[PDB]
Structure formats: structure tokens, C-alpha cells
Design a protein around this ligand. Sequence first.
Ligand SMILES: Nc1ncnc2c1ncn2[C@@H]1O[C@H](COP(=O)(O)O)[C@@H](O)[C@H]1O
Ligand SMILES: Nc1ncnc2c1ncn2[C@@H]1O[C@H](COP(=O)(O)O)[C@@H](O)[C@H]1O
Ligand SMILES: [Mg+2]
Ligand SMILES: [Mg+2]
Lengths: 247, 247
Amino acid sequence: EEHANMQLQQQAVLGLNWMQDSGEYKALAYQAYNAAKVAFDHAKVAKGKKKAVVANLDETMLDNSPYAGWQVQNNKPFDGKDWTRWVDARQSRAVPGAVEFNNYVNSHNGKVFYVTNRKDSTEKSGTIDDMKRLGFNGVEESAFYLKKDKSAKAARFAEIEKQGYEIVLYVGDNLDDFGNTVYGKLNADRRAFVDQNQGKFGKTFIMLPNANYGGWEGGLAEGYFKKDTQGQIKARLDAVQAWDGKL
Amino acid sequence: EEHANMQLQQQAVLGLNWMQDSGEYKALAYQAYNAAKVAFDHAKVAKGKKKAVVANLDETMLDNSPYAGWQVQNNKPFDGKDWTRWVDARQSRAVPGAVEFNNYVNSHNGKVFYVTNRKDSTEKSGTIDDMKRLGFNGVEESAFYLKKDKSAKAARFAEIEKQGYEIVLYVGDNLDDFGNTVYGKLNADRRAFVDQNQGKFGKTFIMLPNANYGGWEGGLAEGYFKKDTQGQIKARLDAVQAWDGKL
Ligand SMILES: Nc1ncnc2c1ncn2[C@@H]1O[C@H](COP(=O)(O)O)[C@@H](O)[C@H]1O
Ligand SMILES: Nc1ncnc2c1ncn2[C@@H]1O[C@H](COP(=O)(O)O)[C@@H](O)[C@H]1O
Ligand SMILES: [Mg+2]
Ligand SMILES: [Mg+2]
């Protein structure tokens, strides 16, 4: 139903305004990348290891908000086929602070590896072109670990380590950017992971804000991503914790 | 119109789910407070000065998300009269990491002052009771600079300084928590302020995420807060930056 599609996408509007328009969002991005530089500079690795930083792309280093805007204007739920066209459109922007941090790491005895669920086979060319255009250094193909057969990221982290790197910090907008332990899990388990790692945030796990999509959306209800539009609307509304209006 | 009220408040749903349910939100809160502790510990003040930290309350140290949930469920635009009842309901929660940071500052030769637009005359009792209940130390009345005649906060910062304190850092969720220079201004000016202070974020200006309300909402359009519901809906939708769907 068109009505259901409109309701689902309208629910994203205020958070999208915040991410696209607010100074507050920019300030959070700068805060993250300022903290990331401090962590990188402090990091020491085992003898014989090279220093690596693992960075997520979408909503961490790359800003895809115009795709979300298109969803709002056209009442379009997320669809990977539309996403591939967005990537091919080569209109990605950079998250504030990301290029400077990336280039700093790469010029100070580190290497940033991009572990990203953009698709290796269909979305690589647009990604690399946009990143070159946006000013990122170190965007040769071998810096990228794009999605092949698995959306969970830990195996790609292990590939990086096998190449003689020690990962000194991770940058992401989704807890699944830090490992697999809450991949596919609901939000209670995801919050528990965060509590169990409280001291790592702003140190070895660097967070960017994303109020628009992610593992937390699927985390709203069992089987969320397989539900129809009406089911997803209901899952979102049922997750709301509301004051009852009484004293 | 009830329809307009519903549309306006539905636009907050996804960001509310993110703030209430996601581990990612918690991780951002811990990141902020972890960075804040590092900044506090590093801070040195002028001879003869006492060390102060200025902290915002709403959506910085206190979590009012159930009020937003009530707005969603009842299609209620923000109204200060409802807000006063929410405060009186004494159901505020603590933002993750806030109590620990607050109590650490207060036990390590600093003092946290709460500069907050909760109302001194009608909202003080609930605020203090909730904070005591939530575990905050140092919540005697004189620690609070609640709203009297002005929503802009710089004059209250100056009052703190007049009492012999040097403010070593500010914690907030709204750029107006750091001074007055973009108070009442639109988002272009607010983003410019952030760019002009890029290096301070995560150091002396500590940010918490708030995708639900703030100076950035008013910043969406000239006279936003005086517009009717339909006008505010239009302002939000007109602010959206959307991909045109072409390559
Ligand atoms: N709104 C959305 N909902 C679900 N998946 C999305 C959305 N937007 C983008 N994606 C997908 O998620 C990927 C980003 O994953 P990640 O590398 O974890 O940032 C994108 O490359 C898309 O395949
Ligand atoms: N959704 C909202 N829209 C506008 N104002 C709000 C909203 N929620 C709370 N407020 C007001 O803003 C104050 C918080 O301001 P601050 O001290 O900057 O965090 C609250 O005490 C309320 O008076
Ligand atoms: Mg991402
Ligand atoms: Mg606030």
C-alpha cells in the first residue's frame, strides 16, 4: 500500500533533518574524529605488526543522506536495487572530519582499511570514484574490504590481521562495525554489548551517529527485516516507550 | 487539525526508536562521557580559580524520551504546559555515563553546575528529586542555574564565573549549551559555528546526540516556532536534501 509506504518513510523525517541540517550532527562527527586521532596517536602495536585503523564507510566516512531524502520524497522503503543506483550516481558526500582523519592516519605510519557493506561486485567503482573526488588518500582497491558473501564484518577484520596488521581502533556507526557478537541480534542484546564495553567508546571503538538505519532497526523486533511495511510500522510504534501522562 | 498533529509527531518516530532502543545511542553517550573525563583530568585553571564543569540537563544528563513517546502516542506537539506535568511526574531517566562523570568531577576537585532550561519556578522540585533518585551527587539547589527570564544560557555561565570558577568544559546536546553566538539563528549559521570550533568538540565542548528536538529544529526555517503545525511540517519537508534518482 502506498499509504503504508508513506507512513513508514515519514517516520524518518525529523532524524533526517537533524543529520542533514544541524550543526549538532557536525559537532558529533568532529568529536568522534578528534577522539579517533587521540586514540591513534596513543596506540602501540606488537613488535613486527603494522598499525591499522578499520573504518566503516556508509554513515561513518561517507554521507548518503540524499538517498534517504529520495526515500522520503518518493515513499520508498529501502531496496538494494535502488541503493546500487544511488552508489552509481556518484553523489556521496564526506562525513565531517573523516577525510582529515583518514589522511592523517595514512601519513603517520598507519593504514586505514575500509570494511564496508557496499558491494564488491556492483558498487566498488562508484565508491572509489566518490572517495577520490572527496579527497580521501589511500583509496587503492586493496584498501577496501567490500561485501562479497557475508554482511557480518569480523571475517574481514581477520583478513586484515592475517596481512600483518594490528587493528588499533575501529570507526563505525553500527555496533556490527566492531565485531560479530551482536550481529543479527535484538536491541536488548546490543545494549548489553555496549554496557560490557563501556570504556572502549571514544577510545578503541569510535562512534558516529546514525538515526536513519542500521542494525538497531532490525533490532526493534524478531524478524523485522522480513516483515511487510505494515509490520515494520507496527514494530517501530510498539517499541516506543511512552509516559502515560500521569504523575 | 488532528491529521496534521499526527503527521508532525510521526516524523519523530524513527529517531525516537534510535534514542530509546539502540545500543548505538548508548555507545555515543559513553563516548561523550569518556572524552569528558579525559578533558576534565587534563584541565588546568588560572591561579585562584576553582574548576567548574557546565552541564546541560535535558537530553544531556537527563533522558526525557518517555515524554517524546507520549507525544507520538497522543499526536501532541510540544507544549510547555505538558512539559511541566512531565517534570512533575518524576520519571526522568539518566543518560548513560552521566551520573558517573558528574560524581567523578565532584569528587576530584571540580564542581558540576547544571545550566538548564527547566524552569526555576515550576520545574525545580521534580528535577532535584529525580536527580537525587538517579544517583547524582552535588544536587543542592545552588548547583542549579534553571531558567528564569532568559532561555539563552551565556548569562548563567557568566554568573558561575563571577563566583570564582573557571569553566573547563561544557557538556550539551544543543549548540546553545556552549554560548549565545548562534542562539535563535538558522542552521547555516549554526553549522558555521561548529566549523569555526572544530577542534573543541570532544575536548572542551562535549556533545550528546538528540535527534528529537532542539535549536536545530527552530533552525530549519525563519520563524519556525511561530508557524502552525502545517507550516512546521512544510519546513521540515522543504529542508530535506534529496537525490533526484538520476545518475
Ligand atoms: N536505510 C537502509 N536500510 C537498510 N540498509 C541500508 C540502508 N541504507 C543503506 N543500506 C545498506 O547498508 C550498507 C551499509 O552498511 P555498513 O557498511 O554497515 O555501513 C549500504 O551499503 C547498503 O547496502
Ligand atoms: N520537543 C521539544 N521541543 C521544544 N522544546 C522542548 C522539547 N522538549 C523539551 N523542551 C524544552 O526545552 C528544555 C530543555 O532545554 P535545554 O536546557 O537546552 O536542554 C526543556 O526543559 C523544555 O522546556
Ligand atoms: Mg555504516
Ligand atoms: Mg538539552
